Structure formats: structure tokens, C-alpha cells
Amino acid sequence: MERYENLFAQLNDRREGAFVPFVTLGDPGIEQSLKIIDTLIDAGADALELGVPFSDPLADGPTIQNANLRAFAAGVTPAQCFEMLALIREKHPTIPIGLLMYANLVFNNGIDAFYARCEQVGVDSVLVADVPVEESAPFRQAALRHNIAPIFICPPNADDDLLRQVASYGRGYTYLLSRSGVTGAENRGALPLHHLIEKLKEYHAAPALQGFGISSPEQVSAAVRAGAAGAISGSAIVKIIEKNLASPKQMLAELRSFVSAMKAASRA
Amino acid sequence: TTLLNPYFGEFGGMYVPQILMPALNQLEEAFVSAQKDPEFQAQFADLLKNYAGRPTALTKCQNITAGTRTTLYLKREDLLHGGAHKTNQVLGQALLAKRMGKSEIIAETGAGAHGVASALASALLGLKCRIYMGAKDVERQSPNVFRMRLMGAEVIPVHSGSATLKDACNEALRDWSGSYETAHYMLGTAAGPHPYPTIVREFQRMIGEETKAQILDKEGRLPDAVIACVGGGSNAIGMFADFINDTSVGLIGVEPGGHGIETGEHGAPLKHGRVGIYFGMKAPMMQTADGQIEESYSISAGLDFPSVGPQHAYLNSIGRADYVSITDDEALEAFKTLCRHEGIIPALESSHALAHALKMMREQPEKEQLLVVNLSGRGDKDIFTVHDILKARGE
Numbered sequence: 001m002e003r004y005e006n007l008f009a010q011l012n013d014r015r016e017g018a019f020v021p022f023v024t025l026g027d028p029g030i031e032q033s034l035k036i037i038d039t040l041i042d043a044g045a046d047a048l049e050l051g052v053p054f055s056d057p058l059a060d061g062p063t064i065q066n067a068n069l070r071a072f073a074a075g076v077t078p079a080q081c082f083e084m085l086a087l088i089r090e091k092h093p094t095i096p097i098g099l100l101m102y103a104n105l106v107f108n109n110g111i112d113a114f115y116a117r118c119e120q121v122g123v124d125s126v127l128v129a130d131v132p133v134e135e136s137a138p139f140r141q142a143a144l145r146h147n148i149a150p151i152f153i154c155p156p157n158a159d160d161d162l163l164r165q166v167a168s169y170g171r172g173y174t175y176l177l178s179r180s181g182v183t184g185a186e187n188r189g190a191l192p193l194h195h196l197i198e199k200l201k202e203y204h205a206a207p208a209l210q211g212f213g214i215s216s217p218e219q220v221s222a223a224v225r226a227g228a229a230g231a232i233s234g235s236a237i238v239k240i241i242e243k244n245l246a247s248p249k250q251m252l253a254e255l256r257s258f259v260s261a262m263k264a265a266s267r268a
Numbered sequence: 269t270t271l272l273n274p275y276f277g278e279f280g281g282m283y284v285p286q287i288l289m290p291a292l293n294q295l296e297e298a299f300v301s302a303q304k305d306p307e308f309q310a311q312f313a314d315l316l317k318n319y320a321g322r323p324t325a326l327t328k329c330q331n332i333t334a335g336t337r338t339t340l341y342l343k344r345e346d347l348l349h350g351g352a353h354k355t356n357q358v359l360g361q362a363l364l365a366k367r368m369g370k371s372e373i374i375a376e377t378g379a380g381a382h383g384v385a386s387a388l389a390s391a392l393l394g395l396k397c398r399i400y401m402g403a404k405d406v407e408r409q410s411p412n413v414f415r416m417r418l419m420g421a422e423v424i425p426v427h428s429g430s431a432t433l434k435d436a437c438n439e440a441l442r443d444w445s446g447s448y449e450t451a452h453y454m455l456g457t458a459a460g461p462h463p464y465p466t467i468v469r470e471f472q473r474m475i476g477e478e479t480k481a482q483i484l485d486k487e488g489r490l491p492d493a494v495i496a497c498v499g500g501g502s503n504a505i506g507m508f509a510d511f512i513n514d515t516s517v518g519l520i521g522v523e524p525g526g527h528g529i530e531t532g533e534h535g536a537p538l539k540h541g542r543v544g545i546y547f548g549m550k551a552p553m554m555q556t557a558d559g560q561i562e563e564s565y566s567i568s569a570g571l572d573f574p575s576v577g578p579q580h581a582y583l584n585s586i587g588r589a590d591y592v593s594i595t596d597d598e599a600l601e602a603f604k605t606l607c608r609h610e611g612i613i614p615a616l617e618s619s620h621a622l623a624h625a626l627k628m629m630r631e632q633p634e635k636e637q638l639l640v641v642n643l644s645g646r647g648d649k650d651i652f653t654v655h656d657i658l659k660a661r662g663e
């Protein structure tokens with residue numbers, strides 16, 4: 001399908017950026033996770049980034065490590081994650097859905113079979129966090145064969161060769177990394193990404209979303225002014241789940257207020 | 269793009285987040301440059317000889333083979349400064365860290381032997397060293413937590429997951445992905461993303477080179493087989509490397525069988541796991557049917573790791589090297605036997621290699637065979653753990 005392309009075309013007409021929350025599928029449980037995701041969408045999420053619980057998420061800091069653990073404590077499996085993805089797409093026909101995967105879960109029962117299953121449930125993109133462009137060939141080939149956008153990372157230390165490869169190989173959106181390190185709201189990016197954003201546009205790369213450490217509305221607006229097409233926020237969202245485990249009503253209310261404020265920041 | 273081949277057949281590669289690829293490429297380039305640099309080689313040789321104590325002895329173990337046709341030599345890496353083979357490649361990697369202008373060292377440890385080695389090399393060479401160690405291993409290998417902190421290293425207990433070596437590896441890599449401009453990750457085994465399996469082999473290969481020269485001097489011929497335990501792969505590939513092209517020489521690696529392979533509580537992915545992608549490499553993994561990485565188990569903290577370096581997976585696949593397992597109880601017997609009959613207290617890791625050699629002898633006592641066991645470390649760190657076990661047995 002064309003869900004990212006249609007989204008960014010609509011966003012450009014409204015002269016606004018995308019706000020894309022991340023959560024772990026099945027955190028803190030399957031049905032509470034489904035309600036959380038509906039609340040993110042009703043509050044204004046333009047797209048979703050969704051993590052499949054993995055035993056050893058080496059690109060994630062403590063906040064999202066604990067989200068993975070909570071999902072495992074609820075017994076959440078990748079098979080149940082695909083069931084959830086089907087239910088989400090059934091309710092929301094146009095929202096772009098990207099998965100955050102670790103390589104072993106994609107490789108486990110066959111790379112091609114993994115992307116075929118993504119296509120069957122209506123996923124739009126896949127980011128494999130521990131597969132650099134140097135190792136990406138069988139993943140990106142299988143993705144494209146199944147109409148899945150392969151999401152590549154543009155890090156702050158990117159040279160010109162990497163910019164050209166990510167621009168050529170990627171689809172859907174380019175992931176513009178805010179900083180080195182692992183996921184987490186406590187650590188905000190330091191460098192300005194203006195030069196990379198404009199090289200990406202020169203090479204006709206997929207529109208850029210900035211992520212890692214985006215926890216406040218100002219950061220969303222700043223990413224859009226810098227030229228990026230939008231911003232991703234994970235740990236800031238997941239912290240609201242963690243803080244409100246004992247109160248699912250106050251959890252959804254505080255998620256709604258936060259997403260609404262982050263999205264409003266993308267409008268100017 | 270790399271200078272060297274990152275794969276051994278289908279195994280290996282660089283499965284790290286994109287952010288870390290410049291660090292790996294820088295490390296590869298520094299290694300290739302240093303391997304051509306006579307000044308680096310001389311510094312490295314100087315440290316190995318005059319600081320670490322190389323060459324290490326090759327001891328002929330006569331009492332424990334009495335009444336059989338097995339001749340058994342032990343390559344005495346237990347006599348290396350620090351007490352284990354880990355010191356060899358730490359000295360080379362520390363020199364690489366300095367060559368790249370790094371001022372800090374990150375290291376994981378389970379047996380604490382690599383932690384101690386990283387700490388002593390950092391104290392000598394002027395690096396600020398921080399060690400990640402699983403909280404379970406902090407306890408069962410505590411004599412080394414004492415050593416590391418005396419030498420100025422920061423030791424960080426890891427309570428996540430199994431609170432053992434795998435979890436320390438995870439946090440070391442997480443840390444490196446946010447500190448690589450100033451910190452070198454001194455990975456402690458022949459595993460992980462390229463170029464570590466290659467670098468660690470080349471910086472351990474003197475074990476086998478010395479062994480070969482020593483066996484030739486004493487016996488006039490090559491060994492029938494060399495035998496080493498396999499936690500991540502470094503002491504075994506260090507012993508194996510110089511014999512790989514000597515096709516008559518058996519290469520036997522010993523994985524931990526833990527409570528028994530059939531219990532699932534073991535550390536034997538090469539023979540009882542299946543290929544997966546984790547810790548920066550494509551390699552045999554202990555994993556669930558779903559592709560979650562399992563937790564391993566071994567009495568020996570240094571072998572308690574649910575994967576294995578890619579060159580061992582390759583050497584196995586083509587039949588050049590053979591891999592077996594040894595249970596906790598088999599390792600404990602070999603530990604006791606070496607203490608009592610050769611006066612050498614071995615690391616419990618190394619005791620797995622010894623146990624398999626003793627099995628080779630006992631199973632076929634009239635088979636003529638010349639065997640070398642890599643005695644990868646001394647057992648001082650294990651004496652308390654072994655005490656509590658034999659006490660609970662009434663021994």
C-alpha cells in the first residue's frame with residue numbers, strides 16, 4: 001500500500017509535521033495495549049511505531065526495557081502481536097503502522113515469511129534495529145517483495161556514502177537519529193541535524209522523522225522547523241503507562257493529553 | 269564496506285545498530301594498521317613477555333594418566349599474569365584503544381577474569397576502566413570483584429535478566445553505543461560483531477603457536493588433539509588457530525553441559541542451539557521456538573553464555589573441529605582430580621576441557637594418544653564455590 005506516501009502528502013498540504021508515538025505491543029497487557037493504541041490515534045497520532053517484545057532489546061534504555069518485560073509478564077508472544085496488528089488495522093484503515101523489530105525475530109522462522117506475515121496483517125514498514133545497511137540486503141529485498149517499507153537509520157555521524165545509501169534503499173520514511181546511545185526520555189539530542197536533513201532531501205530520500213529523546217512539544221516543533229517531516233516519541237509515552245499501571249483510566253487520560261499536546265506542536 | 273571478511277561461512281557479520289558501524293570500522297582499520305606496524309608488534313611482544321610472563325609452560329601430567337596410553341600436556345595459561353588467558357588479548361586491545369585515542373575502556377565479565385585483565389591493563393596503560401558484571405557472578409566469582417576495584421576499575425553490577433554474563437554483555441554494548449567516541453569496548457571473547465572474532469583470535473594465537481613449538485620440542489611430533497573449553501570462544505580459538513592447517517590434529521571444543529543437555533540448563537548452543545542473530549553476530553543461539561534468546565546455565569560463570577563465536581560454528585560446520593559437552597559434575601571431578609594428583613588448581617571453565625580429555629583416556633585406555641588441554645585459568649576464584657558444593661555433598 002501507500003499509507004506513508006499518502007500521509008506525508010496530506011501533511012504537506014496542511015503544512016504540518018507528523019507526530020508518531022511508539023509503544024510496546026502488549027504492554028501492560030494485550031487488551032490494555034489495544035485501548036492505549038486507540039487512545040494514541042484518537043488523540044491525533046499520525047502514524048504508529050510498534051515494538052514486538054524481545055528478550056534482549058539492545059537499542060533500548062530502561063524505560064522501554066521494562067515495557068518489554070511487562071509484555072512478557074503478560075505472556076505476549078510475536079504470534080499474539082500479529083493478532084493485535086490485525087485488530088488495529090481492522091479499526092484504522094489508513095494509519096501508517098511501522099514495526100520496531102530486532103533481527104532474530106525477523107530471521108527466526110525465515111525472513112521472507114516474516115515480511116509476508118507483515119503484509120498479510122496490514123503493516124506498512126519495518127525497522128530492524130540491529131541490522132545496519134551493511135547487513136540489510138535480504139531484509140530490504142524481502143520487505144519490498146511484500147510491499148513493506150524498509151526503514152533505515154540516518155545517524156548523526158553519517159557520512160555522504162551512508163546518506164546516499166539510505167536515500168536509495170529506504171521507503172516510507174527515513175529515521176533521523178537525534179543522538180548516539182539508546183532510547184530514553186532522560187537524554188536529549190545535542191547536535192543540529194540541519195545538514196543531514198537537507199542532504200537527504202537532495203538525494204530524494206523518504207521523508208525524515210526524528211527520534212530518540214523526543215519528550216516535549218518544543219522538540220517536536222524544533223524538528224519540523226529544522227526541515228524534518230516529523231518526530232517519534234517512545235519513552236515519554238511508555239513512562240505514562242508505567243506511572244499509571246494501577247489506574248488504567250488515568251493512564252489513558254494522561255496519554256491523551258500528552259499526545260494531543262505533542263501533535264499540536266507539529267502544526268507550527 | 270570492510271577491509272576484512274566479516275563472515276566465517278554463514279556465521280558472523282556486524283549486526284549492530286547503525287550508530288556503531290563507524291566504531292567497528294575504526295577498530296578494524298586500527299587493527300589492520302597495527303598488524304603491519306613493527307612498533308606496535310614490539311610493544312605488544314614486550315608486554316606479553318616482560319609483564320604477563322609469556323611463554324607459558326607446557327606441563328606433562330603424568331599421575332592422572334597412569335596405567336593408560338594417553339600422554340597429556342596442559343598449556344599453562346593459569347600462570348599468566350592475572351591468572352587466565354584473557355590477559356593476552358586485553359594487552360593487544362588496550363594498545364589498540366590507545367592507538368585510536370580512546371581514554372576509557374568498557375568491558376563485560378562473567379568469570380571476572382576478563383574484568384581483572386581489563387582492569388590491570390587499564391591501570392598499566394592509563395585508561396579509565398568500567399566493568400559490567402552480572403550480580404549472580406559478582407557473588408560466585410567474588411575474589412575477582414575485589415581484584416578489579418583495587419586496580420581502580422569501576423565495577424557495575426547488572427541485575428537484569430539472568431544477572432549473569434549475557435546480561436553484562438547487553439549493558440556493555442548499550443553503554444558503548446552512547447560513549448564510543450571516548451570509550452573502547454574491550455570485548456572479552458572471540459564473538460560479537462566483526463572485527464572482534466578476528467581480532468581476538470589473532471591476539472590469542474600465541475597459545476597454539478607456543479604449544480606447537482613446545483610439543484615438537486618434547487615429543488618430536490604434533491598432538492593427536494588439542495582440547496579447550498568454549499564459553500564465547502577465545503581460549504579455544506587461541507589454541508586452535510595455529511593447528512587449523514595441520515589436518516591430522518584434532519580440534520576439540522568443550523561446551524558446558526550444565527545440569528545435563530536434556531534438562532535445557534546448559535550452555536551448549538553450538539551443538540544444541542540453532543542459528544540466530546544476537547550480540548552483533550549470526551551464530552548458534554540458545555533460543556525459544558519464538559526466537560527469544562534463552563538464558564544459559566553452567567556451574568562455571570565463564571561458560572554461562574547462550575551463544576558462541578562464529579569461527580567455531582564454521583569450523584564445526586565443515587567438520588574441521590569437533591564440539592562436545594561436559595556437565596557440572598564431570599567438571600567438578602576433573603577439578604578435584606587435578607588438585608589432588610597434579611597439584612594444580614584449575615578454573616572451573618578449564619576443568620570442562622580437562623574432564624573431556626580424561627574421558628577420552630578412560631573410555632579407551634589402550635588407545636595411544638598425545639593430547640593437549642588448554643588450562644585456560646587458575647581456580648582461586650572458584651575455591652569458595654567448590655567448597656560450598658562439596659560441603660553440601662558431605663565430602
Ligand SMILES: Cc1ncc(COP(=O)(O)O)c(C/N=C(\CNc2ccccc2O)C(=O)O)c1O
Pocket residue numbers: 352353354376377378379380381382383433437455456457458459497498499500501502503504569570571573615617618644645646
Ligand atoms: C579461565 C577461563 N577460561 C575460559 C573461559 C571461557 O571464555 P572463552 O575462552 O572466551 O571461551 C573463561 C571466561 N571468563 C569470562 C567470561 N568471558 C566471556 C565469555 C563469553 C562472552 C563474553 C565474555 O566476556 C570472564 O569474563 O572472565 C575463563 O575465565
Ligand SMILES: O=P(O)(O)OCCNS(=O)(=O)c1ccc(OC(F)(F)F)cc1
Pocket residue numbers: 022049050051059060064100127128129130153177182183184185211212213214232233234235236285286287
Ligand atoms: O523516545 P525514545 O528515546 O524512547 O525513542 C523511541 C524510539 N523508538 S523506535 O521504535 O523509534 C526505535 C528506533 C530505532 C531504534 O534503534 C535503532 F536506532 F538502532 F534502530 C530503537 C527504537
Ligand SMILES: Nc1ccccc1O
Pocket residue numbers: 270271272273274
Ligand atoms: N571477503 C571480504 C574481504 C574483504 C572485505 C570484505 C569481504 O566480504
Ligand SMILES: [Cl-]
Pocket residue numbers: 011012015016017
Ligand atoms: Cl510540511
Ligand SMILES: [Cl-]
Pocket residue numbers: 055056057065428429438
Ligand atoms: Cl535486556
Ligand SMILES: [Cl-]
Pocket residue numbers: none
Ligand atoms: Cl521473570
Ligand SMILES: [Cl-]
Pocket residue numbers: 179180181182187446
Ligand atoms: Cl547517550
Ligand SMILES: [Cl-]
Pocket residue numbers: 303304305306309
Ligand atoms: Cl609486520
Ligand SMILES: [Cl-]
Pocket residue numbers: none
Ligand atoms: Cl616455525
Ligand SMILES: [Cl-]
Pocket residue numbers: 492493516517518
Ligand atoms: Cl587425530
Ligand SMILES: [Cs+]
Pocket residue numbers: 333334336337338339
Ligand atoms: Cs602414559
Ligand SMILES: [Cs+]
Pocket residue numbers: 498499500523524535536537571572573574575576
Ligand atoms: Cs557457551
